[PDB]
Coordinates of C-alpha atoms and ligand atoms in Angstrom, one line a residue:
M7 CA 49.4 10.9 21.7
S8 CA 52.3 13.3 22.5
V9 CA 52.9 17.1 22.8
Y10 CA 54.6 19.7 20.7
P11 CA 58.1 20.9 21.8
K12 CA 58.0 23.7 24.3
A13 CA 60.2 26.0 22.2
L14 CA 57.6 25.5 19.4
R15 CA 54.7 26.2 21.7
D16 CA 56.5 29.3 22.9
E17 CA 56.2 31.0 19.5
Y18 CA 53.3 29.3 17.7
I19 CA 49.8 28.1 18.3
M20 CA 49.4 24.9 16.4
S21 CA 46.2 24.2 14.4
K22 CA 44.6 21.9 11.8
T23 CA 46.4 19.4 9.6
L24 CA 46.7 20.6 6.0
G25 CA 48.3 17.5 4.5
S26 CA 50.2 14.3 5.5
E31 CA 52.7 16.1 7.8
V32 CA 51.9 19.8 7.3
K33 CA 50.0 21.8 9.9
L34 CA 48.5 25.2 10.0
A35 CA 49.9 27.4 12.8
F36 CA 49.7 30.9 14.1
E37 CA 52.8 32.9 14.9
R38 CA 52.2 34.6 18.3
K39 CA 54.3 37.6 17.6
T40 CA 52.4 38.6 14.5
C41 CA 49.1 36.7 14.8
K42 CA 49.8 35.7 11.2
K43 CA 49.3 32.2 9.7
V44 CA 52.3 29.9 8.8
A45 CA 52.6 26.3 7.8
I46 CA 54.7 23.9 9.8
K47 CA 56.1 20.7 8.2
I48 CA 56.7 18.0 10.7
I49 CA 59.3 15.4 9.9
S50 CA 59.4 12.3 12.1
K51 CA 62.9 11.3 13.2
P64 CA 66.3 11.7 8.5
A65 CA 68.9 14.1 9.8
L66 CA 70.8 14.1 6.4
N67 CA 67.8 15.1 4.2
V68 CA 66.6 17.6 6.8
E69 CA 70.0 19.2 7.2
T70 CA 70.3 19.8 3.5
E71 CA 66.7 20.9 3.0
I72 CA 67.2 23.6 5.7
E73 CA 70.6 24.8 4.4
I74 CA 69.2 25.1 0.9
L75 CA 66.1 26.9 1.8
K76 CA 68.1 29.4 4.0
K77 CA 70.4 30.3 1.1
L78 CA 67.9 30.6 -1.7
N79 CA 66.0 33.8 -2.4
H80 CA 63.4 33.6 -5.2
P81 CA 59.7 34.5 -5.4
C82 CA 58.8 31.1 -6.8
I83 CA 60.7 29.2 -4.1
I84 CA 59.3 28.6 -0.6
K85 CA 61.1 30.4 2.3
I86 CA 62.0 29.0 5.7
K87 CA 60.8 31.0 8.7
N88 CA 62.0 28.8 11.6
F89 CA 63.3 25.4 12.5
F90 CA 62.9 23.2 15.6
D91 CA 65.0 20.1 16.1
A92 CA 63.3 18.0 18.9
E93 CA 61.6 14.6 19.2
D94 CA 60.8 15.4 15.6
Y95 CA 61.9 18.0 13.1
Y96 CA 59.7 21.1 12.7
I97 CA 60.1 23.3 9.6
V98 CA 58.1 26.6 9.7
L99 CA 57.3 27.8 6.2
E100 CA 55.2 30.5 4.5
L101 CA 51.6 29.4 4.3
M102 CA 50.5 29.0 0.7
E103 CA 46.7 29.5 0.9
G104 CA 46.0 28.0 -2.5
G105 CA 47.3 24.6 -1.4
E106 CA 48.9 22.0 -3.7
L107 CA 48.9 21.9 -7.5
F108 CA 48.0 18.3 -7.1
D109 CA 44.4 19.1 -6.0
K110 CA 43.9 20.9 -9.2
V111 CA 44.8 18.0 -11.5
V112 CA 43.6 14.9 -9.6
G113 CA 40.5 13.0 -10.9
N114 CA 41.3 14.0 -14.5
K115 CA 40.7 17.7 -13.5
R116 CA 42.5 19.9 -16.0
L117 CA 43.6 23.4 -15.9
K118 CA 42.8 25.7 -18.8
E119 CA 45.8 26.1 -21.1
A120 CA 46.4 29.8 -20.1
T121 CA 46.5 28.8 -16.5
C122 CA 48.9 25.9 -17.2
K123 CA 51.2 28.5 -18.9
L124 CA 51.2 31.0 -16.0
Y125 CA 52.0 28.2 -13.5
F126 CA 54.5 26.5 -15.8
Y127 CA 56.4 29.7 -16.5
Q128 CA 56.9 30.2 -12.8
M129 CA 58.0 26.6 -12.3
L130 CA 60.5 27.1 -15.1
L131 CA 61.8 30.3 -13.4
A132 CA 62.1 28.5 -10.1
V133 CA 64.0 25.5 -11.5
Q134 CA 66.2 27.7 -13.7
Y135 CA 67.1 29.6 -10.5
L136 CA 67.9 26.3 -8.7
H137 CA 70.2 25.1 -11.5
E138 CA 72.0 28.5 -11.7
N139 CA 72.6 28.1 -8.0
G140 CA 73.9 24.5 -8.3
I141 CA 70.9 22.8 -6.8
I142 CA 68.9 20.0 -8.3
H143 CA 65.5 19.3 -6.7
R144 CA 65.2 15.6 -8.0
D145 CA 61.6 15.1 -6.8
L146 CA 59.4 17.6 -8.5
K147 CA 55.7 16.6 -8.5
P148 CA 52.3 18.4 -8.4
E149 CA 52.3 18.0 -4.6
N150 CA 55.5 20.0 -4.2
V151 CA 54.1 22.9 -6.2
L152 CA 52.2 25.3 -4.0
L153 CA 49.6 28.0 -5.0
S154 CA 49.6 31.4 -3.2
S155 CA 45.8 31.8 -3.3
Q156 CA 42.5 30.2 -4.3
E157 CA 42.3 32.4 -7.3
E158 CA 43.5 30.6 -10.4
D159 CA 45.6 33.5 -11.3
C160 CA 48.2 33.3 -8.6
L161 CA 51.9 32.8 -7.7
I162 CA 53.4 29.4 -7.2
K163 CA 56.3 28.2 -5.1
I164 CA 58.3 25.0 -5.2
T165 CA 58.9 23.2 -1.9
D166 CA 60.1 19.9 -0.4
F167 CA 63.8 20.0 -1.0
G168 CA 64.6 16.8 1.0
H169 CA 65.8 14.8 -2.0
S170 CA 67.8 17.7 -3.4
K171 CA 71.4 17.5 -4.4
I172 CA 74.1 20.1 -4.5
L173 CA 76.1 20.2 -7.7
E175 CA 81.5 16.4 -10.5
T176 CA 84.3 17.4 -8.2
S177 CA 85.3 13.7 -7.7
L178 CA 85.5 13.0 -11.4
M179 CA 87.4 16.2 -12.1
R180 CA 90.0 15.3 -9.5
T181 CA 90.1 11.7 -10.8
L182 CA 90.8 13.2 -14.3
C183 CA 93.8 15.1 -12.9
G184 CA 95.8 12.1 -12.1
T185 CA 97.8 9.1 -13.3
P186 CA 95.6 8.2 -16.3
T187 CA 97.6 5.0 -16.5
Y188 CA 95.4 3.3 -13.9
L189 CA 92.0 4.9 -14.7
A190 CA 89.2 2.4 -15.3
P191 CA 87.3 2.3 -18.6
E192 CA 83.9 3.0 -17.1
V193 CA 85.2 6.1 -15.4
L194 CA 86.4 7.5 -18.8
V195 CA 83.1 6.5 -20.3
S196 CA 81.1 8.4 -17.6
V197 CA 82.9 11.6 -18.7
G198 CA 80.6 11.8 -21.7
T199 CA 77.5 12.3 -19.6
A200 CA 78.7 13.9 -16.4
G201 CA 77.2 17.2 -15.3
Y202 CA 73.7 16.5 -16.7
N203 CA 72.1 15.4 -13.5
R204 CA 70.0 18.6 -13.5
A205 CA 68.2 17.2 -16.6
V206 CA 66.0 15.0 -14.3
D207 CA 64.2 18.2 -13.1
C208 CA 63.4 19.1 -16.7
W209 CA 62.0 15.6 -17.2
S210 CA 59.8 16.1 -14.1
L211 CA 58.6 19.5 -15.4
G212 CA 57.6 17.8 -18.7
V213 CA 55.5 15.2 -16.9
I214 CA 53.9 17.9 -14.7
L215 CA 53.2 20.0 -17.8
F216 CA 51.7 16.9 -19.6
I217 CA 49.4 16.3 -16.6
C218 CA 48.3 19.9 -16.2
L219 CA 47.5 20.2 -19.9
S220 CA 45.7 16.9 -20.4
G221 CA 44.5 15.9 -16.9
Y222 CA 46.1 12.5 -17.2
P223 CA 49.7 11.1 -16.7
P224 CA 52.0 10.4 -19.7
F225 CA 53.1 7.1 -18.3
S226 CA 51.0 4.7 -16.3
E227 CA 49.8 1.1 -16.2
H228 CA 46.2 2.0 -16.8
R229 CA 44.7 0.2 -19.8
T230 CA 48.0 -1.0 -21.3
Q231 CA 50.3 -4.0 -21.3
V232 CA 53.6 -2.2 -21.6
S233 CA 55.4 -1.9 -18.2
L234 CA 55.6 1.6 -16.8
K235 CA 59.4 1.3 -16.9
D236 CA 59.4 0.3 -20.6
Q237 CA 57.1 3.3 -21.3
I238 CA 59.5 5.7 -19.6
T239 CA 62.8 4.5 -21.0
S240 CA 61.3 4.3 -24.5
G241 CA 59.8 7.7 -24.0
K242 CA 56.5 6.5 -25.4
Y243 CA 53.9 8.4 -23.5
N244 CA 50.2 7.6 -23.8
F245 CA 48.9 10.0 -26.4
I246 CA 45.1 10.4 -26.3
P247 CA 44.1 12.5 -29.3
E248 CA 40.6 13.3 -28.0
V249 CA 42.0 15.0 -24.9
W250 CA 44.9 16.8 -26.7
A251 CA 42.6 18.1 -29.5
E252 CA 41.7 20.8 -27.0
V253 CA 45.3 21.9 -26.6
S254 CA 47.5 24.2 -28.7
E255 CA 50.2 22.6 -30.9
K256 CA 52.7 24.9 -29.2
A257 CA 52.0 23.5 -25.7
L258 CA 52.3 20.0 -26.9
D259 CA 55.5 20.7 -28.8
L260 CA 57.2 21.9 -25.6
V261 CA 56.1 18.8 -23.7
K262 CA 57.8 16.7 -26.4
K263 CA 61.0 18.6 -26.0
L264 CA 61.0 18.0 -22.3
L265 CA 60.1 14.3 -22.4
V266 CA 63.2 13.6 -24.3
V267 CA 64.9 10.3 -23.2
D268 CA 68.5 11.4 -23.8
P269 CA 69.4 13.8 -21.0
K270 CA 71.9 15.7 -23.1
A271 CA 69.4 16.4 -25.8
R272 CA 66.5 17.2 -23.4
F273 CA 65.4 20.8 -23.2
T274 CA 67.1 22.9 -20.5
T275 CA 65.1 25.4 -18.5
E276 CA 66.6 28.2 -20.7
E277 CA 65.5 26.4 -23.8
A278 CA 62.0 25.9 -22.3
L279 CA 61.9 29.6 -21.5
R280 CA 62.8 30.6 -25.1
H281 CA 60.1 28.3 -26.5
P282 CA 57.3 29.9 -28.6
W283 CA 54.7 28.6 -26.1
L284 CA 56.2 30.9 -23.5
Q285 CA 56.6 34.0 -25.6
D286 CA 53.4 35.4 -24.2
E287 CA 53.6 39.0 -23.0
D288 CA 50.1 38.9 -21.5
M289 CA 50.9 35.9 -19.3
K290 CA 54.2 37.6 -18.3
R291 CA 52.3 40.8 -17.4
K292 CA 50.0 38.9 -15.2
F293 CA 52.9 37.3 -13.4
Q294 CA 54.7 40.6 -13.0
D295 CA 51.4 42.1 -11.7
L296 CA 51.0 39.3 -9.1
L297 CA 54.6 39.8 -8.0
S298 CA 54.2 43.5 -7.3
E299 CA 50.9 42.8 -5.5
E300 CA 52.5 40.2 -3.2
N301 CA 55.3 42.7 -2.4
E302 CA 53.3 45.9 -1.6
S303 CA 53.1 45.0 2.1
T304 CA 56.9 44.8 2.5
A305 CA 58.1 47.4 0.1
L306 CA 60.0 50.2 1.8
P307 CA 60.3 53.7 0.3
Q308 CA 63.6 54.3 -1.6
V309 CA 65.7 56.9 -3.2
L310 CA 63.8 58.6 -6.1
Ligands
LIG401 C1 55.1 17.7 2.0 N1 54.7 18.0 0.6 C2 54.0 16.8 0.1 C3 53.8 19.2 0.6 C4 54.1 20.4 1.5 N2 53.0 21.4 1.6 C5 53.4 22.7 2.2 O1 54.5 23.0 2.4 C6 52.2 23.7 2.3 C7 50.9 23.2 2.2 C8 49.8 24.1 2.3 C9 48.4 23.7 2.2 S1 47.9 22.3 1.6 C10 46.4 22.3 1.6 C11 45.9 23.7 2.1 C12 47.2 24.6 2.4 O2 47.1 25.9 2.9 C13 45.8 26.5 2.7 C14 44.6 25.5 3.1 O3 44.6 24.3 2.3 C15 50.0 25.5 2.6 N3 51.3 26.0 2.8 C16 52.4 25.1 2.6 N4 53.8 25.6 2.8

């Protein structure tokens, strides 16, 4: 095969594969577990991923612990013991609605925080949502920022200029510019749909309409049997997220104000989990 870089070996003992690639590792200094993402050599996506993770600071967004640029790229992250949200929804497995809500609330908070900070994720899927423990009441963090974008400066400059020569299509694009972040809200809607129902809104399974046609039409596969079990409030929010027009689509703020999320119990649980995660690092402070 091949060997791990010496600088990596110097600080970590590498262990089992967790997914593929992500490996379990032990930090020598602390004897604590970490996760190490190995990216085969690329530079562009890795450079941005790192610079983004370093600057972001939010409980529902994964933190970077270390970085090694060698034969391959190594990104050292927090270990999320609960693993990927994906494993909870595969094989038509479904989460109970109350659990969906606790996880979705935190997803919303994370994506809201991204957008406030001028970052779009662009590739949000159940496999990029991590769970902090094997308990179903737990914290989630978003990860995998390789496809992210940093927020129209070109257009704005173009607008400050000799309008005389400006091309029609440029002027037309002004109507929609600055709504790229809406793709994350679409992704959140699909993820929420899947968590609630245990099946994807759009797929080629038992249907003759192309996946593409389903998506651009916004006509998701609605199976009343499955959804009978789910509140009308939950379904209403999905509908507002799976809106085809990006300017009309619910923002994270709108989603957070939605009746389905006005749930002080769920919020208390999150706040409880937060404080628990933090006890081990909380210093004393001025009374
Ligand atoms: C690359 N992308 C698809 C996912 C990245 N995954 C992580 O960053 C990550 C994964 C895990 C996992 S996955 C399965 C597990 C596990 O940890 C506990 C044992 O079972 C943990 N931490 C991560 N940062």
